[PDB]
C-alpha cells in the first residue's frame, strides 16, 4: 500500500508514572510539558526512503503555529527546540518514538494527528488526544519547584488543613482537595474554557495558558460566581436559605462536581476558606504548586490608604459604618512560580485570592502578587498589591460615633493588630507553619514602619495623657454552645487620683468577617478605683440569650466602653468562639487497600432538649468515592449516638477522613481522622 498507520500504543501507564500524573483517576493520557513521552506506532510496512511522517498537535478552537497552539514536526533523528519526535528504533513495521513538547507549551487538552507523505501523496489521520499540564519537576519550567518533599506537599497531596478561629484560639479544619478524584482534573480544565477571557477571544486565551501568572489570575476569577457564573456563590449574611451553610462543606470535590453537573451554575454557598480550598484544588490539578494561607485580623481596605476604620457608639455597640472592615481571619492561596514580568527577586510564592472582595480590571479577581514584593512594600507591581498589603498590614483606627449629636471622634490607632499568625499547613504533617515573617517585617521594628511609609508613598488630633484606666476582658471557664458564657472585665487605675469609671458593655453575635447579626446582652456598671486598684466585673450570658442569634461561626463580640471624667473613652474588645459538642470518628480495624474498614462516629447531645434533622456527611480521597450521607435519628436530651459505616480504601498512604454533623441546634460540627492505609 501507500505507507499508512495501523495502530498506536500510547504506553499510558508508563508515561503517566514518568510524568508524575499517575494518581489522577482517569483513563486519559496525562502528561507534563517540556518532558518526552514514548509511543509505539505500527505501520502497514517499513518506511520507504521517499517517505516521511509529520506529527501535528493542536489545542483549543483556533490553533495557530505562531501562537504555539499548533505544532507541525517531522519524525526525525533530532530534537530541534519546540515540539519534536525522535525515531528511537524500527523493528519490522513498528516505530519506537519519543515525542516532546516545549517547556513553554500552553497547558490543556491536545489532539495529535499524523500526516504521511508517500508515493507523491499526502494523507492525514487523527491519532488521539492527551492532556498537558505544568511541570514542577522540570528545572526550566516557570513553575519548577526543586525540593522533592515540598513538591509532594504542594502538588501531590490531596488532603489538607486550613487554620481558622481567631488570634485568641487558632483552630483547624480538614479539607479534601481531591484533585485526583473522578472528573476533577477535567472540570478544572473546563474552568479555563468558560472564563470571560475564553468567551471573548478563545485564541488569545488558549495561547496564554502557557503562563502560570495568567492561569492563576483566571482561576482567581472563575472560582467565584461573580461576573462569569463561576464555581462558588459567596454569602456572609448568616442566612443560607437555598443552599449549604458555608461551614458544612468538607472539600472541593462536591463543589466542583455540583458546578459542572448543574450546567456550570454557581454552587451555594461559600466563604473564604471554601473559595481557597477550591482554588487550591484547581492549582494543584493543573500543576501549579500551591498552598492555603490564613491571615488573622485581616483588613479590607476599600479606599487604598492602608488604614481601616472601626466604629463604636458610647454605649459599647459595634457599628456597621464605613466600607472598610476587619475579619477575624481571611483565607487565600499562594502559587509557586517565577515572575518574568517583575524579575528574578520576585519569584516564588504568589498570592492568589478567589474570594470576591475588590474588582481588579473590572472583575472580581486577585493576584498574582509577589509575597516577597509585599513584604518589601513594592505595591506598584502587578497584581493587586495595595489590597493585599492592607490585608496583612493595614493600620486600624478606632472611632467613637454618637448619631444623636452626629459627632465622630478618633479613639486610637493600632499599627500592630492587623495581620497576625499567618498560617499554612506544614510539609508532611498537620503542624501549623507561621509565615507572618514572609509577609511583613516584625511588628515593633523600625523596618516595619519604614516599609509602611514606603507603601503608603506609592499609592488635627491632640495626643492626650496616657489613660488612667486600662482594661481587658478574660474568659472564665468553658465556652461551649449550650453553656452560659462567663467573662470578667478587669480594670486598673494607673493615675494618682481616685477615679470613677463608667462602663457600657454589649455582646453581639457576628459572622467571622465582622458582620453584625444581633445584640444578645448588654449591661452598664460604675466602678470607683483607688490609685493602683484593679477590680473585676463579671459578665454572664445565658444559653437562652444567645441561642437564637448565634450563627455557625459560634462567635460573640463583647465590648466594654469605659470612661472617666475629662479623659477619652477606653474600648476593651474581645471576640469569643464557643466550642461545638464533641464529634469523633474512629476506625475499628487497620485500614488496608481494597478491604472494607468499619468506622464509628460518636456524638453526645449536651442539651436538655432533643436534636433533630441529624445528618452525617463523610468524605476523604482514597477512603471513599464521593460523599456519604447518613440520616441519624432524633437524639433525646443528653443522649449519645453511635453510627457505624464501612469505607473502602483505594490508595495506600496517610489519608484523611472528614465528617460534618448537622442538626437543628448545631450546624456544621466537624471531625477529622488521619487514617494510615496499608498495602
Amino acid at each position, epitope marked *: 500500500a501507500a505507507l499508512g498507520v495501523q495502530s498506536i500504543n500510547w504506553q499510558t501507564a508508563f508515561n503517566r508514572q514518568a510524568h508524575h500524573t499517575d494518581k489522577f483517576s482517569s483513563q486519559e493520557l496525562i502528561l507534563r510539558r517540556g518532558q518526552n513521552f514514548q509511543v509505539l506506532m505500527i505501520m502497514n510496512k517499513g518506511l520507504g526512503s521517499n517517505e516521511r511522517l509529520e506529527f501535528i498537535v493542536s489545542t483549543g478552537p483556533y490553533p495557530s503555529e505562531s501562537a504555539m497552539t499548533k505544532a507541525v514536526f517531522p519524525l526525525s533523528n533530532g530534537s530541534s527546540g519546540g515540539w519534536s519526535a525522535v525515531l528511537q528504533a524500527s523493528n519490522g513495521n513498528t516505530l519506537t518514538i519519543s515525542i516532546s513538547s516545549p517547556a513553554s507549551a500552553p497547558i490543556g487538552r491536545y489532539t495529535m494527528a499524523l500526516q504521511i507523505f508517500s508515493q507523491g501523496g499526502i494523507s492525514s489521520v487523527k491519532l488521539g488526544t492527551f492532556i498537558l499540564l505544568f511541570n514542577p519537576w522540570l528545572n526550566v519550567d516557570s513553575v519548577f519547584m526543586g525540593n522533592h518533599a515540598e513538591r509532594e506537599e504542594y502538588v501531590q497531596e490531596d488532603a489538607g488543613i486550613i487554620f481558622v478561629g481567631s488570634t485568641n484560639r487558632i483552630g483547624m479544619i480538614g479539607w479534601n482537595f481531591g484533585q485526583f478524584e473522578e472528573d476533577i482534573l477535567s472540570i478544572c480544565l473546563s474552568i479555563l474554557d468558560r472564563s470571560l477571557n475564553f468567551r471573548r477571544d478563545a485564541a488569545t486565551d488558549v495561547a496564554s495558558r502557557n503562563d502560570p501568572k495568567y492561569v492563576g489570575r483566571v482561576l482567581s476569577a472563575m472560582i467565584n460566581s461573580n461576573d462569569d457564573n463561576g464555581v462558588l456563590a459567596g454569602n456572609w449574611s448568616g442566612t443560607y*436559605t437555598g443552599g449549604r451553610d458555608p461551614r458544612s462543606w468538607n472539600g472541593s470535590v462536591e463543589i466542583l462536581k455540583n458546578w459542572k*453537573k*448543574s*450546567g456550570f*451554575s454557581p454552587v451555594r454557598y461559600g466563604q473564604c476558606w471554601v473559595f481557597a480550598g477550591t482554588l487550591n484544588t484547581a492549582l494543584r490539578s493543573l500543576g501549579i504548586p500551591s498552598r492555603v494561607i490564613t491571615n488573622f485580623n485581616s483588613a479590607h481596605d476599600t479606599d487604598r490608604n492602608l488604614s481601616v476604620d472601626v466604629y463604636y457608639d458610647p454605649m459599647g455597640n459595634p457599628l456597621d459604618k464605613g466600607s472598610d472592615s476587619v475579619w477575624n481571619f481571611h483565607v487565600w492561596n499562594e502559587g509557586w512560580f517565577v515572575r518574568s514580568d517583575l524579575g528574578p527577586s520576585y519569584g516564588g510564592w504568589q498570592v492568589l485570592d478567589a474570594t470576591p472582595q475588590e474588582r481588579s480590571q473590572g472583575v472580581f479577581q486577585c493576584g498574582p502578587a509577589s509575597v516577597i514584593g509585599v513584604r518589601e512594600g513594592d505595591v506598584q507591581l502587578n497584581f493587586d498589591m495595595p489590597f493585599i498589603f492592607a490585608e496583612v498590614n493595614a493600620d486600624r483606627i478606632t472611632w467613637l460615633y454618637d448619631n444623636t449629636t452626629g459627632k465622630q471622634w478618633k479613639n486610637s490607632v493600632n499599627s500592630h493588630t492587623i495581620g497576625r499568625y499567618i498560617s499554612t499547613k506544614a510539609v508532611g504533617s498537620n503542624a501549623r507553619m507561621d509565615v507572618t515573617d514572609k509577609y511583613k517585617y516584625p511588628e515593633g521594628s523600625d523596618q516595619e514602619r519604614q516599609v509602611f511609609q514606603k507603601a503608603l508613598g506609592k499609592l488635627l488630633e491632640t495626643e492626650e495623657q496616657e489613660p488612667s484606666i486600662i482594661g481587658k476582658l478574660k474568659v472564665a471557664g468553658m465556652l461551649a454552645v449550650g453553656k452560659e458564657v462567663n467573662l470578667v472585665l478587669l480594670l486598673k487605675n494607673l493615675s494618682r487620683d481616685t477615679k470613677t469609671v463608667t462602663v457600657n458593655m454589649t455582646a453581639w453575635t457576628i459572622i467571622y468577617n465582622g458582620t453584625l447579626v444581633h445584640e444578645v446582652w448588654k449591661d452598664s456598671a460604675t466602678m470607683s478605683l483607688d490609685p493602683e486598684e484593679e477590680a473585676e466585673h463579671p459578665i454572664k450570658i445565658s444559653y437562652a440569650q444567645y441561642e437564637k442569634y448565634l450563627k455557625s461561626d459560634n462567635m460573640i463580640r463583647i465590648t466594654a466602653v469605659c470612661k472617666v471624667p475629662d479623659e477619652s473613652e477606653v474600648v476593651v474588645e474581645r471576640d469569643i468562639i464557643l466550642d461545638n459538642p464533641t464529634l469523633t470518628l474512629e476506625v475499628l480495624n487497620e485500614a488496608r487497600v481494597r478491604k472494607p474498614v468499619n468506622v464509628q462516629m460518636l456524638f453526645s447531645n449536651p442539651l436538655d432538649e432533643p436534636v433533630r434533622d441529624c445528618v452525617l456527611m463523610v468524605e476523604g480521597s482514597g477512603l471513599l468515592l464521593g460523599n456519604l450521607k447518613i*440520616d441519624v435519628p432524633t437524639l433525646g436530651p443528653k443522649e449519645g449516638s453511635r453510627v457505624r459505616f464501612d469505607i473502602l480504601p483505594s490508595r495506600s498512604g496517610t489519608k484523611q477522613l472528614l465528617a460534618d454533623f448537622s442538626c437543628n441546634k448545631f450546624p456544621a460540627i466537624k471531625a477529622m481522622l488521619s487514617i494510615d492505609v496499608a498495602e
Partner: antibody
Amino acid sequence: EVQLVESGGGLVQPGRSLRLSCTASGFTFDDYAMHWVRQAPGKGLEWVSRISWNSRSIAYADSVKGRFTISRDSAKNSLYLQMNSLRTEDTALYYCAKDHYLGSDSYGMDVWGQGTTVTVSS
Amino acid sequence: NFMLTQPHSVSESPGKTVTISCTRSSGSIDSNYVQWYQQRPGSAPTIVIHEDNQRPSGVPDRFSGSIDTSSNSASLTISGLKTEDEADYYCQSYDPSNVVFGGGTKLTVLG
C-alpha cells in the same frame, strides 16, 4: 421524615380548570426546588414542572406549557399546579416531589407524595 | 433536549446480578447527574441512586449505579437479586431546564 400530601384531584371536563395543592413538612421547604410529575395508569413517569427554591426559575414540559402554572407559598409550606385547558391526555396520577439537591441547580426527586388522581373526560 | 432510552424489560434468577441501561440520545451522559427510582404497583416511586452512583440512607449495598461515557449510558446494577427486587425501575437526568425520565424497565426475578 419528609411528608408531601397532594390534593385537589378529581373528574373534570376537557377545557375546564383544576388546581392541585401539595403540603410539605419535615424539611426546610424554602431550601429546595419542587416538582410535579405525573403518571397515566399503567404508563411511565412524565415530568410536568419545576419551581426553584426562591421561585425565580420555573420550567414546564412542552406538553403542558402555556396551560399549566406552578407556584409555591413559603408561609404555608405548599406547592401548587393550576391546570387550565385540560385534555383527556392529562389524565394521570399527579405526584408532588421534593428535589434532592441543596445549593445547586441539578434536579432529582428524593421524596414523592402518594399523588392525587386527575381524570379528564366529557 | 434529549431522551433517555432503557430496555423494556430485563430478568434474572434469584441470587444473580442484573443490569438496566439508560442511554442518553444527545449530549454527554456525564454532563448531568443521573438518578434511579424503584416503583412497585400501587406505590409512588422511591429513589435508589442519586448523583450517578451514590446510595440513599436505607438502600441496600446490592444496588449500585454507574456511568459509561463510551456508550453514553448510565446503569443500575442489582447483585444478589431477591424476589422483592421485582419492580419497575426508571432512570432520570436533566439539562438546565427540563427533567427527563427514561421510559422504565420491568425487572422480573425469574420464578
